[PDB]
Design a protein around this nucleic acid. Structure first.
Length: 104
DNA sequence: GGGTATTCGCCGCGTACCTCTCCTAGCCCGCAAGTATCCTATTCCTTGCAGCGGT
């Protein structure tokens, strides 16, 4: 199947992650001076926080344990973004309800 | 190895509509307000030095 098609095997390992446009995930105001949940942006901010953390720690040459832990956390963040729940434990913001990953 | 049994984990479970409510938690730093305190006067008394009539 691989050789028949034009897909290299290693493309199953993500190196660059696309982001959904903004308007398809609009930030609806609640008119109480605040904003609603809009959890997709929450997952995106989470993964970006992990990414920047790892970027800094890689720049500053920390001991391998720290970078390994942070890369594990980043892997979990991407897992949450692409499909939340298929891993051992889902993540929630409140109400003990899982958020809506793209696959959901 | 190999045919078999047993277990684990994922997938699925009706349509359309109406009413209501509620939507992150915790720290922190500027900041308004309210206050107790400190310096500011007046009246009495007893000193210490510079002018000053007087001779």
């Amino acid at each position: 199947a691989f050789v028949q098609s034009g897909n290299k095997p290693e493309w199953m390992i993500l190196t660059v992650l696309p982001v959904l446009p903004p308007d398809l995930r609009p930030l609806v105001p609640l008119d109480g001076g605040r904003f609603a949940t809009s959890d997709l942006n929450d997952l995106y901010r989470r993964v970006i926080n992990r990414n920047n953390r790892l970027k800094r720690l890689l720049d500053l040459a920390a001991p391998d344990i720290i970078v390994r832990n942070e890369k594990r956390m980043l892997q979990e963040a991407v897992d949450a973004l692409l499909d939340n729940g298929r891993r051992g434990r889902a993540i929630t913001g409140s109400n003990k309800r899982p958020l809506k990953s793209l696959a959901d």
